[PDB]
């Protein structure tokens, strides 16, 4: 299953909060704003995320202007946060951190 | 100059309205939602736009989820719509239309 | 299986030859050069192919300079042309044709 | 001018050799192979380079398969290595090093 147990969810939220993600209050979704130096960096980062979204069949809701990228993750068919969201968030952290 | 004359602005708005763009009421900006078949198409389109944004040093405000891309254009330093916005919009129409 | 039957291979080669691909003589691989108007188009095309490569876990050998993209497809683990190569080639044709 | 003085060329070659580039013997061009962990990384890197190529109007000759990217730089109109090649190489080093 892609569903999180209560234990897995608790742990995922701790880990994601440590990584700077927040939970939305009105949706079962997580959110984070990334700020790069420029658009070259931001769009290079988006390109990596896009590749992974297609590998996983799991897609972000995201906004960009120049160096800023705002990302909301949730599992659109399920209506809830799942292991797919946690995995994509962890990949996004890796893609962002390298620059 | 990148500034539009009154005549050039009037004509640009007519052309952009014909292309499905709208003017925002609260900002001097234009807006359009694009709907593709899938994310592969949407992100391929975004990649072309990103390339052009760097060629022009002129960047969109944009939101994507899966096949949908929402774009707002304005010239951030100027506070107004300029020839840069018109040129980028026309390029975006070309990139979208080819699929 | 991803392997082609003799019938499926014969048919795939006919279809791919009609689409402008050639068979290499020294490898069980197919090859085609694409020529676009510019790099914006060529790299937009590459971005779509890259997305699909990650969706499929199947990667091209490719060369680009400006508007030209040369692609060789074969299944690297198998040493032969497979259904993965045919599927990716058909996707590449779609991505190229739209511009 | 984009042309290198003899002093600037000597210094550029030293710096680029330190960065792992080589001079081709038969062309006035420089060459380097990059090896990433995977295609996600390699294509994210290519996307950054593509953006910069359009910003600069200066394009690589490059080959990719999975995690490997081979790049040859020269100024196609000039027939020689120029400041554009040095600048793009330095950008490529930055894009590669971050991962």
UniProtKB/Swiss-Prot annotation, chains A, B, C, D:
Record PTM N6-succinyllysine, positions in chain: 83, 87, 94
A Gene Ontology biological process term: positive regulation of DNA-templated transcription
One example GO MF annotation: 4-alpha-hydroxytetrahydrobiopterin dehydratase activity
EC number: 4.2.1.96
The entry's keywords: Acetylation, Lyase, Tetrahydrobiopterin biosynthesis
Record's GO cellular component terms: mitochondrion
PTM annotation (N6-acetyllysine): residues: 83, 87, 94
Reaction it catalyzes: (4aS,6R)-4a-hydroxy-L-erythro-5,6,7,8-tetrahydrobiopterin = (6R)-L-erythro-6,7-dihydrobiopterin + H2O
Subunit organization: Homotetramer. Interacts with DYRK1B.
Function summary: Involved in tetrahydrobiopterin biosynthesis. Seems to both prevent the formation of 7-pterins and accelerate the formation of quinonoid-BH2. Regulates the dimerization of homeodomain protein HNF-1-alpha and enhances its transcriptional activity.
Name this protein carries in UniProt: Pterin-4-alpha-carbinolamine dehydratase 2
Species for this entry: Homo sapiens
Name of the gene: PCBD2
First and last residues shown, out of full length: 32 to 130 of 130
């Amino acid at each position: 299953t892609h569903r999180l147990t209560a234990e897995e969810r608790n742990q995922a939220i701790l880990d994601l909060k440590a990584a700077g993600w927040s939970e939305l209050s009105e949706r079962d979704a997580i959110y984070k704003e990334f700020s790069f130096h420029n658009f070259n960096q931001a769009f290079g980062f988006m390109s990596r995320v896009a590749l992974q979204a297609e590998k996983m069949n799991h897609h972000p809701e995201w906004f960009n202007v120049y160096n800023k990228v705002q990302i909301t993750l949730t599992s659109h068919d399920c209506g809830e946060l799942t292991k797919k969201d946690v995995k994509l968030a962890k990949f996004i952290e890796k893609a962002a951190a390298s620059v």
